[PDB]
């Protein structure tokens, strides 16, 4: 991370200086806001944490609960989700506290032993090279804490307005500004029944399964009935079952159970299959029968419930009627994210993960449009992108409901999907057609940017290239240099740089607000195949050693080389970069690859951004 | 980390529940305390952070400054120091904020260019396999913050009493208790001149170079005059010198300069050699002349000073007159740690690192003696251990003041020393003679426990074996199993376990306080050469799957296997364990190896602890 850009600043650098552009939090919900987020769940808090980085935008997030939760229902944190946490700079903390899932063991009835289970299998939870982070388990409330702190420590000093239940949302397609009117009811005993009204430019319903925002704009969850029902109990118990600290799938004559080891090394979660006139004792009794001959002595039960939901999904995620928007469609004003527009069966294994990816998709778009850096039409891509991949995910898990090798295929694909790295957007306003995909085979257009190790040239530090992509709303341009680029500036990477800084028609010059840092909209990172010791910084374009901030201090983290010390760690090899041609990999603020273009196709680059950005 | 041992606990698990055994902090310094620490510098705060883990001990730390510092003079954090930070569970945070030192480049005058420098060399800062953590640079005040938070979040809820200057310390060798009387003068304007008195059992002077505690007990820094003088400036400047983000040693016709890249990617520290009627401007001017033809445009200077000190050291670190203590010597009551008893020349490169190792050495000893778990004689080893290695360090850096390969030898050894991993205690009350060193060649008796990767059997998680050693005052017993131990319990590791739990004469039974967790004094960790998948937990002694806490929850982190997935990562190979015999590696609470014993030499194990522990 970088700090002290404008002078020494004491204390933890992750606490940002309060921005004057942002009015202090008030007891009463403001009358007018840019964005009103409804619901402090994974989705709501994810969006709020993203918008909190832009103090020029007025964001208000409401939640009907009277305060932060301390113990939540979701606990699975996918690899891709961890990558996003890294973007919010708190993945590190999650890794130290969460319970990693390295293996998953399977238990079935012992063939020779009557009514007793035995271990039948074991698989590595995350296939090699799938992600730089592992799949982990951590109490949902803790993820909330991190987002709540990020929000609080942001320049926005953003915090939620609790004990507020959104009663209704209306859009005045005739209003000149703040067309959305939200009616809220205060739920705390001290204000019980009090009605609040908020004028918003955009409203985001992240209010869960029984979302009022969804029903307010007439959308509806379409799907099937609750396939199964699960008894879920978090327990502090003593057992001799040897795989208790692993993620375990148990099938037995007396029922099926799923074991999820919890953070701390002691707590354990049990998913007991069923199908409320059902108790903990019954669940425990069932788990005991299943675990037999292994003994389960439950000492304490911090939490337990009943997880039962069908897979449903809205046809659209916003208030725009057209199934497929076009340049003449009304613009969206209200969006739905998370369970409010799509719920997945427990067996799907998505948990809260996929839900947060909706918010990460919408986040930067809202900010760009509000800042008038992008045409409002951009907002249409939120629904077309997130609705489609959700439906495709459901279609897949619809058949996962079970050749022997066709199953190992289903099993493998399911892993990539639960890890959250299977999302692949189809060609669109933002996504290219992949005609130059061979330039960087390892960076599939439309999928998340698969990070790989590189070596920073300024100080020889080993780093994950994809970690340059932080949740700061910036587009990234990873320019992998052709073999001779460093030696021949007439073309290649250096020529691209020359174009990006000096050609008035370049997207960098056209769309970067006057007076802002040269990398405030487009974060360019250059990667040369040459050993870091062979890259002379002093001979590189200023665009690659950009001054910034009030003191013109130099950013020395824009230039990289491959890891040439350790065998098989060269990113040019790992990601299939065309060595002779090089490659420009354009990445969205949500870490998704938009394009893989030839370094020399400057016109294509300009044209791309001209299609949705505003000069 | 492990938590929820006695029930679900919300919030950050690193915040410990307040212990009732510890009285709340008071505005006025308590009248009587177990330990009085003088000075909130690296040493003082390190000791306080260690003692804060024992709420049954009354610890008071005073500092004359009126509050925590925000910008300190020291900034180099050695590998070994990082290992200790890992023991205090905040090494992670330091790694994310600090500026890593991967390479060190050397610059000298260009032979063909008049009065201009050119790069002459480059070396990897930390030789391969020296430590699992790198050498890093971070503002001293931040290390203080971490210690201050650890202290605050401990069961002790420990915080410093500021604006107190210790005027005098006296020992009443006739007192029945609290033989040490400390006289303090309040320095804050509101209490200016007020005299405070404290009765303490032990006093630790961590009050720096001009320490009053040292002079109070008649000790004195013996050494040579200030070899050199250095102008030190932390600056926010713009330069085109290409190696500014590296640690750089520059020798030129116009002077010598040392570049230390600071946390944040922008701040930089410059050590300008000299030898106060000297200004920043002069330093800057000198640095510019040195950096020529490279330009240095200083924009801001958060801090600057003049580092000038000779290498001096006390003959003893406590108030006991005998040069070498024996069973009939008076017991120590006052100890000196850090610069108060030993200062190293800037070129030595020790910074504040070695200083904190004194406190980490004394910490657990004081606690054990106060808890009557160890004979007070143990306290003698503090001085004999820390004084000797400090002097030996000085003797070495005395000659480092410069065959060509004899220099590369001096250069290499100097690196291990600056990394803080060269400390090697000679045989003593605590340190063995190494007659069975071949059992575990990679764990040199008397040196720090060189961690290596292993695989936890309960959940297959990759971990650093040495990270089992936390700053919790516990001795560790790393039992590396013989090849057939798992298959033949009659002897080997399993037999050792049988002895440790069932033989009344075992150190574990003899010295673990009645009613405490079976691993509260001796932290046993077993390592089998077999693949983790081959270790059946359910068939292991209870000592290896120990119940603990109020609920008898099982600790599943006592059993390990090697990393057999990745080539050349098997700890039995990496650390030279005798495969046929196995090995017992006994480690002190400060992470230093005390013994390497045969698994079967139970008598030797007992005898060792009987020599200083109290039943
Ligand atoms: C009983 C139960 C048990 C579950 N068990 C599991 C499990 O074991 N494993 C698992 O992976 N998932 C489980 N889930 C699902 C998991 O909780 C969700 O997938 C996850 O919470 C979805 O995140 P989200 O942001 O979309 O919305 P949610 O987490 O559903 O949050 C919506 C938020 O909006 C607020 N809100 C709603 N309406 C309004 C309104 N009108 N005004 C103001 N605020 C409002 C709510 O109070 C809530 O905080 C369970 C769900 C339930 C209901
Ligand atoms: C001007 C200066 C510049 C330096 N520059 C560098 C540098 O560039 N690089 C580097 O590596 N090292 C530098 N050092 C050395 C570095 O600061 C020390 O090595 C490090 O602080 C030693 O840690 P310590 O815990 O032993 O004691 P110290 O950090 O010296 O702290 C002693 C503490 O005790 C307190 N104290 C002292 N006497 C009393 C009393 N009677 N009553 C109450 N409180 C008292 C002090 O106020 C202080 O907080 C510098 C030192 C000085 C003085
Ligand atoms: Xe499930
Ligand atoms: Xe750009
Ligand atoms: Xe386009
Ligand atoms: Xe120095
Ligand atoms: Xe022991
Ligand atoms: Xe001994």
UniProtKB/Swiss-Prot annotation, chains A, B:
Its EC number is 1.14.13.23. Its cofactor is FAD. Changing residue 282 to R: In MobA3-1; able to hydroxylate 3-aminophenol. GO terms for molecular function: 3-hydroxybenzoate 4-monooxygenase activity; FAD binding; protein homodimerization activity. It catalyses: 3-hydroxybenzoate + NADPH + O2 + H(+) = 3,4-dihydroxybenzoate + NADP(+) + H2O. CDD domains: PHOX_C. Changing residue 405 to R: In MobA14-1; able to hydroxylate 3-aminophenol. Keywords: FAD, Flavoprotein, NADP, Oxidoreductase. This is 3-hydroxybenzoate 4-monooxygenase. It comes from Comamonas testosteroni (Pseudomonas testosteroni). The lineage of its organism: Bacteria, Pseudomonadati, Pseudomonadota, Betaproteobacteria, Burkholderiales. The gene is mobA.
């Amino acid at each position: 991370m970088q700090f002290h850009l404008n002078g020494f600043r004491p204390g933890n650098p992750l606490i940002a200086p309060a921005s004057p552009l942002a009015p202090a939090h008030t007891e009463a919900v403001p009358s007018q806001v840019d964005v009103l987020i409804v619901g402090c769940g994974p989705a709501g808090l994810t969006l709020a944490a993203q918008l909190a980085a832009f103090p020029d935008i007025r964001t208000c997030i409401v939640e009907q609960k009277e305060g932060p939760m301390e113990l939540g229902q979701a606990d699975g944190i996918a690899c891709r989700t961890m990558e996003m946490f890294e973007a919010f700079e708190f993945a590190d903390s999650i890794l130290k506290e969460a319970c990693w899932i390295n293996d998953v063991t399977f238990w079935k009835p012992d063939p020779g032993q009557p009514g007793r289970i035995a271990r039948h299998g074991r698989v590595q939870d995350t296939e090699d090279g799938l992600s730089e982070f592992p799949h982990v388990i951590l109490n949902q409330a803790r993820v909330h804490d991190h987002y709540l702190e990020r929000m609080r420590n942001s320049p926005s000093r953003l915090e939620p307005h609790y004990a507020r239940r959104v009663l209704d949302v209306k859009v005045d397609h005739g209003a000149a500004d703040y067309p959305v009117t939200v009616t809220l009811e205060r739920c705390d005993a001290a204000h019980a029944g009090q009605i609040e009204t908020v004028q918003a430019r955009y409203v985001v319903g992240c209010d869960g399964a029984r979302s009022n925002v969804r029903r307010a704009i007439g959308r509806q969850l379409v799907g099937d009935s609750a396939n199964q029902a699960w008894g879920v109990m978090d327990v502090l118990a003593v057992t001799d079952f040897p795989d208790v600290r692993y993620k375990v799938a148990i099938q037995s004559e007396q029922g099926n159970v799923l074991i999820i080891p919890r953070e701390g090394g002691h707590l354990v979660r049990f998913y007991v299959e069923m199908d409320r006139n059902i108790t903990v004792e019954q669940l425990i009794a069932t788990a005991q029968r299943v675990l037999h001959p292994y003994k389960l002595e439950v000492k304490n039960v911090p939490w337990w419930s009943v997880y039962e939901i069908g897979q449903r999904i809205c046809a659209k995620y916003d208030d725009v009627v057209d199934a497929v928007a076009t340049p003449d469609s009304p613009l969206p004003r209200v969006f739905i994210a998370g369970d409010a527009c799509h719920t997945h069966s427990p067996k799907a294994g998505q948990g809260m993960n996929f839900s947060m990816q909706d918010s990460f998709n919408l986040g930067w778009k809202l900010a760009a449009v509000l800042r008038k850096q992008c045409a409002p039409e951009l907002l249409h891509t939120y629904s077309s992108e997130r609705q489609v991949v959700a439906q495709q995910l459901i279609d897949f898990d619809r058949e996962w409901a079970k050749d022997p090798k066709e199953f190992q295929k289903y099993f493998e694909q399911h892993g990539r999907f639960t890890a959250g790295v299977g999302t692949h957007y189809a060609p669109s306003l933002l996504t290219g057609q992949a005609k130059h995909q061979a330039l960087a085979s390892g960076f599939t257009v439309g999928m998340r940017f698969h990070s790989a190790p590189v070596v920073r040239v300024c100080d020889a530090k080993p780093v994950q290239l994809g970690h340059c992509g932080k949740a700061d709303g910036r587009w990234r341009l990873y320019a992998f240099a052709a073999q001779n680029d460093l030696a021949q500036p007439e073309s290649g990477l250096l020529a691209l740089c020359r174009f990006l800084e000096g050609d008035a028609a370049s997207p960098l010059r056209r769309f970067t607000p006057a007076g802002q840092d040269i990398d405030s909209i487009f974060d360019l990172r250059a990667v040369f195949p040459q050993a870091y010791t062979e890259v002379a910084l002093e001979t590189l374009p200023a665009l690659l050693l950009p001054p910034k901030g009030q003191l013109g201090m130099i950013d020395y983290e824009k230039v990289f080389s491959p890891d040439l010390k350790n065998a098989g760690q060269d990113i040019f090899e790992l990601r299939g970069i065309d060595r002779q041609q090089g490659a420009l990999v354009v990445v969205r603020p949500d870490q998704y690859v938009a394009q893989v273009l030839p370094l020399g196709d400057h016109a294509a680059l300009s044209a791309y951004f001209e299609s949705f950005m505003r000069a």
